[PDB]
Design a protein around this ligand. Structure first.
Ligand SMILES: Nc1ncnc2c1ncn2[C@H]1C[C@H](O)[C@@H](COP(=O)(O)OP(=O)(O)OP(=O)(O)O)O1
Ligand SMILES: [Mg+2]
Length: 417
DNA sequence: CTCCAGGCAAC
RNA sequence: UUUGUUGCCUGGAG
């Protein structure tokens, strides 16, 4: 049956190679992915037997506080490499049981689906005429998952008692706080490979309810939003759907994040929309802000890196960044921040030549005319002031940065379309 | 298409 | 320090 199919050699090797590919930091017992094979070779006889019997209670997860993009802190729960290995093996077999029967409009944590699919569908509704969003998000979503309501929804498709106990064991598994196991009454650990699937299994009913009501929506994990014809209809469905998941499913809603605003006045998966009669996809203000922040630190202040290395490091971020944000239909802002990147990249180039003699040497070598060299080389104007002067645009223009290895943001934006 | 390494995004 | 799912981007071996 199922737990036999989970523990098949072929399934465990694919689960092994995943854990090893991730190179995650060790769980509570300090064994890294680098010695996962040698661990299982030594202890599989004990592990294999113990878990199929129903007795195996897994190792408690490790608590790690990390920052979230919103502002606050996220409590991680890192299982042991073997518990990551086992959870992966469960996930690999449970996926084809549940995933085909998940909603058409569910895009989070699923294979062959991404954030772009969720945004394009969301755009489709506002483009047709449903020009008001019912934005929503849940408070501490993974932490506030009730074990009984989860396992009930798991029990619908998987009838095997051995795996239901195994999944519950991982839910039950505690946290090790300075050498004591603290029991977990509610919540799946953020860090267990099986946790995202379990999250979708619970919210599967939310999709079916919204599908039953005949509502247009796009879900990506807890970030769910429903699109409507007017604000009255949007306000109506907001508190109605709020009470559904709060009583039937028992999950709290984040009222700070949840709102019934216009779609172009809110952010959905790092994107927003435009006021236009056909609503174009644009960058969210935070998406621009985070790019700026990352470019500001990559360009060297008290940091100290080689110049061509920084061009490679900026390329490596920006080319990766535009890989995701290519979905936007506004090259104007992309042209602006590309120019801004160059102005930031001139700040380092300018500060590299501190003395005027080196400035005169480098500008003359670059091909700038002798009148322009002397006019700017010995200026009282600040570094950020001199970066936007006619002289430094000429000497260190887009032509220079392209010829010295810098990848054009807007070029690759077009080349990815 | 599967596999390897480096990265970027969403949650 | 930093786990996880999922998707893509760049290079390499089949
Ligand atoms: N880096 C991550 N590692 C592991 N799980 C994550 C990570 N980021 C997000 N998740 C998971 C766990 C979260 O409960 C779930 C929904 O994300 P998110 O809404 O950002 O956090 P949250 O729902 O726990 O808190 P919040 O109250 O701030 O919305 O996605
Ligand atoms: Mg949330």
């Amino acid at each position: 049956a199922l737990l036999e199919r989970i523990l098949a050699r072929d399934n465990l090797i694919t689960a092994l190679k995943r854990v090893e590919a991730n190179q995650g930091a060790p769980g509570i017992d300090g064994v890294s992915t680098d010695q996962l094979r040698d661990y299982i070779r030594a202890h599989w006889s004990t592990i294999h037997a113990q878990l199929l019997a129903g007795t195996y209670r897994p190792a408690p997860v490790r608590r790690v506080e990390i920052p979230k993009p919103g502002g606050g802190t996220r409590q991680l729960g890192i299982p042991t490499v073997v518990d990551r290995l086992i959870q992966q093996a469960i996930l690999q077999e449970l996926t084809p049981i549940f995933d085909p029967d998940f909603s058409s409009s569910s895009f989070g944590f699923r294979p062959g689906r991404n954030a772009h699919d969720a945004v394009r569908q969301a755009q489709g509704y506002i483009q047709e005429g449903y020009r008001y969003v019912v934005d929503m998000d849940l408070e501490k979503f993974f932490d506030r998952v009730n074990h009984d309501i989860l396992m009930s929804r798991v029990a619908r498709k998987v009838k095997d008692k051995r795996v239901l106990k195994l999944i519950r064991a991982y839910l039950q598994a505690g946290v090790m706080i300075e050498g004591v196991k603290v029991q977990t009454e509610e919540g799946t650990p953020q860090g267990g490979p099986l946790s995202p699937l379990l999250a979708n299994i619970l919210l599967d009913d939310l999709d079916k309810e919204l599908e039953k009501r005949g509502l247009k929506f796009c879900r990506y994990a807890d970030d769910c939003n429903i699109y409507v014809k007017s604000l009255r209809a949007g306000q109506r469905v907001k508190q109605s759907i709020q009470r559904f998941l709060e009583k039937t499913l028992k999950l709290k809603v984040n009222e700070e994040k949840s709102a019934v605003d216009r779609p172009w006045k809110r952010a959905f998966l790092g994107f927003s929309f435009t006021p236009e009669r056909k609503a174009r996809i644009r960058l969210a203000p935070r998406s621009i802000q985070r790019l700026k922040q990352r470019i500001r630190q990559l360009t060297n202040p008290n940091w100290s890196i080689s110049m061509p290395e920084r061009i490679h490091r900026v390329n490596q971020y920006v080319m990766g960044w535009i890989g995701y944000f290519r979905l936007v239909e506004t090259p104007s802002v992309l042209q602006t921040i590309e120019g801004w990147i160059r102005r930031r990249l001139r700040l380092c180039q300018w500060l590299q030549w501190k003395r005027v003699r080196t400035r005169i040497r480098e500008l003359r070598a670059l091909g700038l005319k002798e009148t322009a060299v002397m006019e700017i080389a010995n200026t009282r104007k600040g570094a950020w002031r001199t970066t936007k002067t006619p002289q430094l645009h000429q000497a260190l223009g887009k032509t220079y940065w392209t010829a010295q290895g810098l990848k054009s943001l807007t070029q690759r934006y077009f080349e990815l379309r």
